[PDB]
Symmetry: C4
């Protein structure tokens, strides 16, 4: 038996770029590290400016670049300067002790 | 094989507050206890006034406060006074015994 | 790996009712035909308006043909709309393939 | 604990058809390339209109290049739209990493 719970949250991630025709969210690899989020992990991305809510996967950005970029169709759901929260969830046995989320506040 | 089934439902939760620039959904910890919903658990939140449907995670509110508050980008999807249903699911092997959902009706 | 795959689909379910101030209520015989159980999570997609939502199943009276959207979901349909109702299961992709139970109501 | 990670991505799939009164049909050789199986749940995202949906996969004829949105999903695209089609898997992250299968149809 499993339930979904918060694993990681990055708060106040400022969008630095967007690329519709990408060759999904790019995040500074050091921020990913702080948040215990791995390459290709599924995340929920929510936008404080426009209210958009979406799910996509993570691409590594360059370490210490502060890159936060929405690529592909997700580019249509933001603009540069928007503030995001980026959330990862995990499925756990509810008979186990509670998971303590990793919280990263970029503000 | 595993399927998702209803584990908990809080019905007719009235929004008492909203804060866009939070430092998700805040629920009276006593109400959470009645519904067997734990802090940081993922929930579906559906709004009877405006029809909005979203997924977020639970933050504890003060016991017996009747606080129901949508924080962060979710704040853009409600107004004070709106009536919510708050739902949590669980993944189970359906060859096991049925999950009997915990139903909390606040109306 | 664990992946999600289709386990049941009810096609061309016609909305018979909606009640804002109550989920999806489905004739219990149709549920059995689809191998969908009470309180199971389902995807509901609407051919008339394109709406897509997830909710849980409530039993309707057997052989009533009841298909009703209740609660906030009521704002996402009207009586007479045609729905597809889909349930998924998580399984090992290398183990024997799941044959979905398909129920066509047209 | 389990987390969801990318397992398969088809990029720049051009919509060739849509049929409301039949959900995504994909050339079965493209599916094989992407390690996507019949009835697998997929995320479909549209570069032209920004729409994001979840549905399941139906086999199309091999080497046809068919990419067709069926059912209510038909209301969320037009012929010629470019799609990305994504599948995820739940894994124990302390095991070895899933190397995603990437198929670029551009
Ligand atoms: Cl995207
Ligand atoms: Cl939020
Ligand atoms: Cl609902
Ligand atoms: Cl569909």
């Amino acid at each position: 038996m499993l339930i979904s719970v918060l694993k990681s949250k990055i708060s106040y991630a400022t969008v630095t770029g967007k690329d519709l025709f990408y060759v999904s969210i790019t995040i500074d690899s050091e921020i990913m590290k702080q948040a215990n989020i791995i390459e290709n992990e599924k995340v929920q991305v929510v936008n404080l400016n426009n209210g958009e809510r979406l799910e996509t996967y993570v691409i590594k950005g360059e370490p210490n670049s502060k890159t936060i970029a929405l690529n592909g169709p997700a580019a249509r759901r933001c603009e540069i300067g928007d503030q995001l929260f980026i959330i990862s969830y995990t499925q756990v046995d509810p008979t186990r002790e509670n998971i303590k989320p990793k919280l990263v506040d970029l503000k």
